[PDB]
Amino acid sequence: KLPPGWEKAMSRSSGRVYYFNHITNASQWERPSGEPARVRCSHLLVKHSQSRRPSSWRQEKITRTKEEALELINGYIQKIKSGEEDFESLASQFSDCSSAKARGDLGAFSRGQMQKPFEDASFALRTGEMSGPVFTDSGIHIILRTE
Numbered sequence: 716k717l718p719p720g721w722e723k724a725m726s727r728s729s730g731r732v733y734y735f736n737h738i739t740n741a742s743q744w745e746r747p748s749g750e751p752a753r754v755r756c757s758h759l760l761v762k763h764s765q766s767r768r769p770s771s772w773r774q775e776k777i778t779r780t781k782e783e784a785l786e787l788i789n790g791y792i793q794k795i796k797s798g799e800e801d802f803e804s805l806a807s808q809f810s811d812c813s814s815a816k817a818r819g820d821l822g823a824f825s826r827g828q829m830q831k832p833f834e835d836a837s838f839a840l841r842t843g844e845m846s847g848p849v850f851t852d853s854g855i856h857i858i859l860r861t862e
């Protein structure tokens with residue numbers, strides 16, 4: 716019954732069922748709804764000391780740990796989900812990628828162009844949906860499918 720990658724799960728704190736996508740790392744209380752040759756996505760990348768290139772326009776030498784990058788990703792996701800902050804706003808200010816200057820937009824792409832975990836999460840998102848933390852050799856991403 717569930718669309719690609721989704722599974723039912725049990726919430727530790729409340730006991731209420733929720734849904735988790737192991738391809739995108741998304742999670743939500745609501746039952747999910749539901750492939751194209753191309754999708755369009757934006758992202759916010761947080762790099763760490765084990766990133767393929769630990770440098771960015773924000774910081775010449777990125778020194779934070781993988782665990783610290785994941786905490787930062789978690790906090791941005793919280794603020795996007797509560798509406799305190801827009802995704803485009805946080806990507807512009809804090810993404811460790813040159814795509815930050817374009818509010819995180821990467822344009823359209825097909826399968827066979829992106830790093831595999833990014834590509835998989837991108838094509839498993841529905842239009843308008845956001846990923847959880849997505850791990851690649853560049854760092855940790857939040858992905859927003861826009862088309």
Ligand SMILES: *CCC(=O)c1cccs1
Nearest residue numbers: 760811812813814821853
């Ligand atoms: C900053 C460059 C980067 O990590 C990516 C480019 C396209 C998808 S990830």
